[PDB]
């Protein structure tokens, strides 16, 4: 019940968002949310 606790402190941090992520790939997968990334039908 407490917000705010960082943990992992990856390189791979979304500045569109404020996410993190371990791994570059991983974040690819989240890009398609912001910015057009790979196949997303019509
Ligand atoms: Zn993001």
Same mark, same amino acid.
């Given at each position: 019940?407490?917000?705010?606790? &960082? $943990? $992992?402190? #990856?390189?791979?941090?979304?500045?569109?968002? *404020? #996410?993190?992520?371990?791994? #570059?790939?991983?974040? =690819?997968?989240? =890009?398609?949310?912001?910015? *057009? &990334?790979?196949? &997303? &039908? *019509?």
């Amino acid at each position: 019940g407490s917000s705010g606790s &960082s $943990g $992992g402190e #990856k390189p791979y941090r979304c500045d569109q968002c *404020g #996410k993190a992520f371990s791994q #570059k790939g991983s974040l =690819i997968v989240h =890009i398609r949310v912001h910015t *057009g &990334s790979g196949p &997303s &039908s *019509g």
